[PDB]
Structure formats: C-alpha cells, structure tokens
Amino acid sequence: AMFSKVNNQKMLEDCFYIRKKVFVEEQGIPEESEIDEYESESIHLIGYDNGQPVATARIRPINETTVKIERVAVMKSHRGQGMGRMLMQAVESLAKDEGFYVATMNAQCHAIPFYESLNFKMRGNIFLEEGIEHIEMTKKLT
C-alpha cells in the first residue's frame, strides 16, 4: 500500500473513482453533491495497493495553520484499523509537509476510540444533543 499527494489529473480521477464507488454506488450519495466547490482548494491524497486505487482523502486548508480532513473513502475490501492507521499517518505527513500544524475532522461515535488511539482530541461541548452522534476532533501535528 503506497500513499501519495495527487499531482496530476490521473491521480485525481483515481480519487473520484474511489469516492464514486464508495459514496455514490455503495452509500447512495449524489456524485454532484460529493464533488463540490471545495475540491479545487483542497490537497488530495491517493493510496494504491498492488497498483490499484484503494483509498483517498482530501485535506482542506481552513487558514494558515489548520486543515480539515474530509471526503475520506476506502474500498470495502481494504477497510480496517491497519489501513485506517496507514491512511491517517499519510494524511498527517502530507499536512505537515504542506506547512500545517493542526488537523481537524468529523468523527462518528463508533470511530472515537480509533481517533483517540491516534492522539486526536475531542473539541466542542461536553454533551451531545440526542440525535447528534458525531464530533469534531483535532490533532496537533507538531
């Protein structure tokens, strides 16, 4: 499994393909919803396994120091804590390399133990209103 910053149109298409299969086909979200106005201003990451595109994420600067990690998609046959850790390590490395200090991301309840094992920290209120089962998490990259 190898991870790289997207620096050409093919690598990008590889990212949208993975997201089409996961978000649109597997999960039912519309293609023109998921590919948004923020694509152009984000950095993209692609992971390959034996030459095959299997994982992507985008890293969207919100200011000089902080990036939001979004649109993370991994092909079903490659999902697990191992891949999760490899993906997040690559995302962190890329963000650092691009001159950022903080990563933020949204997490559902089931994922919080995983993010905590990566030294992400909850941000926000101490209580979630019934119906809210997601939170922002943040990590200092330095």
From Swiss-Prot:
Its EC number is 2.3.1.-. GO terms for molecular function: acyltransferase activity, transferring groups other than amino-acyl groups; glucosamine 6-phosphate N-acetyltransferase activity. Residues 2-142 form the N-acetyltransferase domain. CoA binds at V72, A73, V74, G80, P113, F114, Y115. Gene3D superfamilies: 3.40.630.30. It is an enzyme of class 2 (transferase). Keywords: Acyltransferase, Transferase. It comes from the Bacteria. It holds the Pfam family Acetyltransf_1. Transmembrane segments: none annotated. PROSITE patterns: GNAT (PS51186). Belongs to the UPF0039 (ElaA) family. Catalyzes the transfer of an acetyl group from acetyl coenzyme A (AcCoA) to an acceptor substrate and releases both CoA and the acetylated product. It displays the highest activity for L-threonine. It can also use L-tryptophan, and to a much lesser extent L-tyrosine. This is Acetyltransferase SACOL1063. It comes from Staphylococcus aureus (strain COL). The lineage of its organism: Bacteria, Bacillati, Bacillota, Bacilli, Bacillales.
